[PDB]
Amino acid sequence: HRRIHFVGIGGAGMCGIAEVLLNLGYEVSGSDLKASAVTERLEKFGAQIFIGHQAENADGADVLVVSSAINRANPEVASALERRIPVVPRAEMLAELMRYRHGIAVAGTHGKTTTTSLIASVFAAGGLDPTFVIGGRLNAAGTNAQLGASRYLVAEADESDASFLHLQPMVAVVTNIDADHMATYGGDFNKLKKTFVEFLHNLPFYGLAVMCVDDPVVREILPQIARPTVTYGLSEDADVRAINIRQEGMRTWFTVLRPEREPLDVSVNMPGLHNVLNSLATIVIATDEGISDEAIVQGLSGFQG
Amino acid sequence: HRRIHFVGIGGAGMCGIAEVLLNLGYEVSGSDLKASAVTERLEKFGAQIFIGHQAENADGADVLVVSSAINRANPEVASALERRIPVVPRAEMLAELMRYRHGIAVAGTHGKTTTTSLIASVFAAGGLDPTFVIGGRLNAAGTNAQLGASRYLVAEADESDASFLHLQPMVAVVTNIDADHMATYGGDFNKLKKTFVEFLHNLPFYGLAVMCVDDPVVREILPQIARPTVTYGLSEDADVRAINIRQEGMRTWFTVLRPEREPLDVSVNMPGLHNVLNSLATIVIATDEGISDEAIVQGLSGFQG
Numbered sequence A, B: 001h002r003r004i005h006f007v008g009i010g011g012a013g014m015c016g017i018a019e020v021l022l023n024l025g026y027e028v029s030g031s032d033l034k035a036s037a038v039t040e041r042l043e044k045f046g047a048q049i050f051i052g053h054q055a056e057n058a059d060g061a062d063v064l065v066v067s068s069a070i071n072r073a074n075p076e077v078a079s080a081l082e083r084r085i086p087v088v089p090r091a092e093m094l095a096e097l098m099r100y101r102h103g104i105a106v107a108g109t110h111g112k113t114t115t116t117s118l119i120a121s122v123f124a125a126g127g128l129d130p131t132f133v134i135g136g137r138l139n140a141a142g143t144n145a146q147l148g149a150s151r152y153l154v155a156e157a158d159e160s161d162a163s164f165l166h167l168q169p170m171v172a173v174v175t176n177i178d179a180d181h182m183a184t185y186g187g188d189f190n191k192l193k194k195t196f197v198e199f200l201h202n203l204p205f206y207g208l209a210v211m212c213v214d215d216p217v218v219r220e221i222l223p224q225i226a227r228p229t230v231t232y233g234l235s236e237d238a239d240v241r242a243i244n245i246r247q248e249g250m251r252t253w254f255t256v257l258r259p260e261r262e263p264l265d266v267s268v269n270m271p272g273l274h275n276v277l278n279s280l281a282t283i284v285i286a287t288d289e290g291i292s293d294e295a296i297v298q299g300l301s302g303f304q305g
């Protein structure tokens, strides 16, 4: 048993991480300047809450988690550093949660948010109530449960995030590879591409890499990936393909072709080929997980945008 | 359920990995040019064995493992590449085994082999029959069991190995950081040091980093490690220390000081302060794991060299 202490536990990105850790059985304490409904919920769920910051609040903690909104002058942080207690940024602890669950990491420069939401929507339609991470915020749509209760954790994997390479997913998507975040990698696109290869090799040999081969950079690195892979796209050589794209209103329809399955007609309330591709990525993951066609259809059409 | 196929399964570094995978419940097949006692043992334990190489041998495999002794012209490898089956080097699969066990990774430029052996010796004295990896070879001293049966996997972690950063240990030792393998890191020692920091951050936040602070480079990076750490050495500021070093024959005696424990007198059949330090590293790990003083004393004195 360990105690994790959160400095600023009421912050929007912190409260969700504390709740997941509570759900996993850890002792959780936290400090914040103001009591709120967020801190009362955490206390109801087993968190010890302190109001105001003082060195005593950090006593007994085996780890501190600190936001990007805390000075090092903060007495709790300073006490932990003096006693050699580890202090970890919010984002590393967030990435760490995937080690306890069946982690689905949605990587790619664009489309992570939509693809993660579609995945959550489909899993929920299949009765699975996943916890999912968008913009650093843990969520579980309509759940009557603590965050992290599901077996599944679906998270955006941002290549500009310092913890990108410490994610340990079971399944990983790569929607596309753009140059937006070259600065994270010394302004070198080739280094940025190599990071995506290393990220996919954090998968276990039984894992699954879900690769958009309509993106030329994803297609380029594909031969480098020594893990099971399923490819998707409109490309005629993709494993999972969309054909017969059409509109009926603000709703996009298309037919998805999958290995050893009959063609499946789906719709989504979102325009553009990039959202057809995001739907394909979702369909691959859901198919790999054994989710029925009926939940896939329901999950895709029910998502709004 | 997955099937792993080993090309050259009788090779010395391959047979042990196949046995561990069998113990974990996977289907395992393998090909080799010659039947031997190694391949008959694997067959007795559930492996399907083929003699000679041909593309048919790789059928149904979800992954191939290939030695560094196989041409790409090898028909089994070629068949797998055509069908998009993942082909992984022996060393990556070996590192992967740590994900299924309580992994203890013994890193550092020098002293990995001795320290790993001492750890195994002490754990065995405590009745724990660990599997351990030295020189790429899986071993379990005097075990009446399949490799990998123990909860514990103790392995050398070599910084020149391509899989160094894909190890997922629960505990990690760093004996020292030397410049021997700078070439692996573009001939830059500072890059080599940064890799050791990244390696220790593969630990979980509940993990343990065991750090020799007698090495100036290990002491330098220590403030960077945001994980629980225990330090050891002759330095007076080390958490776990050796004092009163003395000889009686070819046997080295010393007293180990540990936080909140009485001083403990130990001996080892090996000369030099580097083997006192390797013993300290062992004592820290064994103490953290709850192993008794009597097994620690027995494990250290029983090891020969």
Ligand SMILES: [Cl-]
Pocket: A223, A224, A225, A226, A227, B085, B086, B087, B088
């Ligand atoms: Cl491959």
Ligand SMILES: [Cl-]
Pocket: A085, A086, A087, A088, B223, B224, B225, B226, B227
């Ligand atoms: Cl720290």
